[PDB]
Amino acid sequence: QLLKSVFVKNVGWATQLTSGAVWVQFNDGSQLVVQAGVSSISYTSPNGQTTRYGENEKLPDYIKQKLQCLSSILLMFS
């Protein structure tokens, strides 16, 4: 289910799953899960509360920041 987990200083951990999904554990206690085939993203706050967002919803700012950092992480994997 898990592949190689990569540590990114100043950000946190980034892991790729067998299902083609990426799971990021940020150093602020939040988590982010995305999948290639799915049209939604999962965000978990530091307090353990999960919220799923769709592609057509306006996302909060911090979600977009973490999606940007995730985009950078995927970029450096090439």
Binding site: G20, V34, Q35, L67, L70, S71, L74, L75
Partner: peptide, 22 residues
Amino acid sequence: QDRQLRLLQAQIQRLLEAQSLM
């Protein structure tokens, strides 16, 4: 699986462009 990762990169980029247009 670099394929699924590339598809994921394109997906996240499209989502970010769409979010910029909101």
